[PDB]
């Protein structure tokens, strides 16, 4: 009994197509992703294969303006158009709190949504009653498939679920529910959920009954063979895992950002045991045409985004100095603002627990391409920011040796002189240059925030120590001569859309007062 399984995860509401590095689409001809594109390839498969399932494992809920505007309604009324079969809940699904999930999604969503390890108490319990289910018995062909859900116990630390929701241990809560499936003549049981590639594997091992595991949360990419883009694999697809009862349990995962659609042919015996498991995550390169009838319904909704571009987000009571002659030379308040928005945005909606304490940011002047004037009415709209951050990049998280960090800060002034926008506007860092000295021996003080230290202060940077820092993708990929980052970086995860990050910070702050406060000095 062959079962073709289409799976996605960590889609981060990238509804219109992106570029290879998961930023704003540039070359129309070479762009990837899209729910327009995805629909095409899913419909192709369904019109061919007889046994198909289309699953998601969460983090569908944060990322672009799309969400910032439609706040989960865009998700439902499109996932319902792709005709998904089940979905699990994510780190980011509770970013709008329970009712920013229960109202927009769980009610408006036309397909069952699972997690078994999440239980509610008190009055929320009645309200939410059976909008989120622990398992689902999803009939395919003349057979039936069980699908059991889970969600990371890390969720309360990376989201805002209120104090009425409990997050039980994945394994604990799955076992009793998988057992019930076998209690009701369901032999064929898929696990589906958002706890991270690591826990996905521990579900394989330690949960009897479970035949297949589909996960996400960790942006990890599995490929068998030659990677079809920059995506570095970290295991074969599927990833076989030796269970304790002694089964082969295939664990899968698409990258993220709705770039790759998961594709896995699973062949079963008469009694619900995995015998064969082969396939590779279908990349959505420009050679798949975007479906027209969806690209229409995209541009129908595009209009309410344009409307939001001109709406007042909040107000400044100070000039936001973003001019070349400011941010490219000395410490400008705009930089200080952005960096603060980058970090703050990260500590509410953290991607994984590895980044939930990130207090360091850097930003090249050559990404700050406009100031914002207060004189008018103090008003700040999206369009304002588009002038500041027109590159439509992202804010990515990188782990970096102090040695590497020092190097880049010397390359901040090695060729000082004219515009050369490599000068770094910092956040969670105190730096001092002495310009008299030799280019590449000018940083005289560099204190950084050590949060993995009881009460966090600025302690001088050690060249041995490893440092978890946020910065633009422009810099993670060695923009303005920063080859030393792209090379000597230890971890790199793509984050949310640059403009979207500020526009949120400003909305939730409502009044900004970004000052120049002596992060950067001379002598």
């Amino acid at each position, epitope marked *: 009994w062959e079962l073709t399984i289409l799976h996605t995860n960590d889609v981060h509401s990238r509804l219109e197509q992106t570029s290879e590095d998961s930023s704003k689409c540039v070359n129309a001809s070479r762009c990837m992703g899209g729910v327009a594109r995805l629909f095409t390839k899913v419909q192709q498969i369904r019109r061919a294969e007889p046994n198909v399932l289309l699953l998601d494992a969460g983090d569908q809920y944060q990322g672009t303006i799309w969400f910032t505007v439609y706040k989960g309604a865009e998700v439902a009324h499109f996932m319902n158009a792709l005709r998904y079969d089940a979905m699990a809940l994510g780190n980011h699904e509770f970013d709008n709190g329970v009712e920013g999930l229960i109202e927009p999604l769980l009610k408006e969503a*036309k397909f069952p949504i699972l997690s*078994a390890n999440i*239980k509610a*108490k*008190g009055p929320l*319990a*009645s*309200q939410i*009653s*059976g*909008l989120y*289910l*622990p*398992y*689902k*018995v999803l*009939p395919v062909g*003349d057979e*039936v498939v069980g699908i059991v859900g889970y969600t990371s116990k890390e969720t309360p630390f990376l989201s805002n679920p209120g104090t009425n929701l409990v997050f039980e241990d994945e394994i604990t809560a799955l076992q*009793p*529910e998988v*057992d*019930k499936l076998k*209690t*009701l*003549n369901v032999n064929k049981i898929i696990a589906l959920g958002h706890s991270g590639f690591e826990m996905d594997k521990l579900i394989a091992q330690k949960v009897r009954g479970v035949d297949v595991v589909v996960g996400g949360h960790s942006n990890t990419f599995l490929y068998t063979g030659n990677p079809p883009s920059k995506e570095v694999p970290a295991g074969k697809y599927p990833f076989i895992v030796t269970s304790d009862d002694g089964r082969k349990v295939p664990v899968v995962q698409a990258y993220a950002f709705g770039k790759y659609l998961g594709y896995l042919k699973i062949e079963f015996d008469e009694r619900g045991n995995v015998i064969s498991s082969h396939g590779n995550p279908i990349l959505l390169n420009s050679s798949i045409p975007e479906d027209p009838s969806i690209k229409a319904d995209i541009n129908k909704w595009r209009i309410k985004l344009d409307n939001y571009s001109t709406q007042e987000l909040g107000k400044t009571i100070v000039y936001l100095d973003g001019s070349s002659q400011s941010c490219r030379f000395r410490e400008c308040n705009m930089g200080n603002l952005i960096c603060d928005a980058m970090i703050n945005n990260n500590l509410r909606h953290a991607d994984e627990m590895f980044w939930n304490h990130v207090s360091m940011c850097i930003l090249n002047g050559g990404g700050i391409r406009s100031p914002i004037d207060e004189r008018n009415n103090g008003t700040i709209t999206w369009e304002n920011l588009a002038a500041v951050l027109p590159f439509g990049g992202t804010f990515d998280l990188v782990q970096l040796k102090g040695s590497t960090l020092k190097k880049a800060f010397e390359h901040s002034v090695h060729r000082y002189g004219q515009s050369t926008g490599e000068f770094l506007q910092v956040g969670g860092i105190h730096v001092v240059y002495d310009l008299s000295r030799k280019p590449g021996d000018r940083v005289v003080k560099l204190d950084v925030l050590c949060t993995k230290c009881r009460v966090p202060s600025y302690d001088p940077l050690k060249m041995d120590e490893v440092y978890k820092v946020i910065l633009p993708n422009f810099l993670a990929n060695g923009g303005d001569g920063f080859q030393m980052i792209k090379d000597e970086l230890l971890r790199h995860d793509s984050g949310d859309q640059d403009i979207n990050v500020v526009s949120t910070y400003i909305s939730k702050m409502k009044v900004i007062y970004p000052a120049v406060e002596g992060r950067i000095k001379f002598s």
Partner: antibody
Amino acid sequence: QVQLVESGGGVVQPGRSLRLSCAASGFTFSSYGMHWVRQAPGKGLEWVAVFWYDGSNKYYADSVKGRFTISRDNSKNTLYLQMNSLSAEDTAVYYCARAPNWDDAFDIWGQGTMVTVSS
Amino acid sequence: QTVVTQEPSFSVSPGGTVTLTCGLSSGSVSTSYYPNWYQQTPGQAPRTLIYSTNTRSSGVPDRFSGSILGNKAALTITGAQADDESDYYCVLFMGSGIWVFGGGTKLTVLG
């Protein structure tokens, strides 16, 4: 293998309290929902009450709101229903049925027990 | 309160097709009410037939096949046996704990 038996059986005069038990066996009692459903002889089925998996959640029908009290004992794999302030419209057959955590469903049903309340 | 209204009685020829419907006094019935059908031999414990609206339960014959017709949840019996002469209860869960039965449809198949 799996079944549900109930206790109650008798006849009672209007007003008096009456307790109902439902002895379960042959499954992870610990896991499933547990309901009460009544059926007035000849008439249709009516939903009474429900107890979920963990305890926190108990719900009753508008018809027996706070007139009836449901209690689960997983220590003893048995479900209970406290029926205070009885009348003639409570005269019916009283089944306990298990629910899998699915659509909060109803796969297995008990033999049922008879509740006759008259002068 | 809201009444779940399902046909009061039906008759079918053996080896025939018949559909029981099950509707809601105020509003439509969708999948997201989790329809659910039961077979009761008059005076006996009601056995399950179909939950989810579509899904057959353990060891339910394939002849029984649930659906939704416009406003109402439905149950199609394609190829009736004499074995099927009993009472059939539809029932929906409008969440918060609220579960509500149908009046019951009495299905007759004699010859």
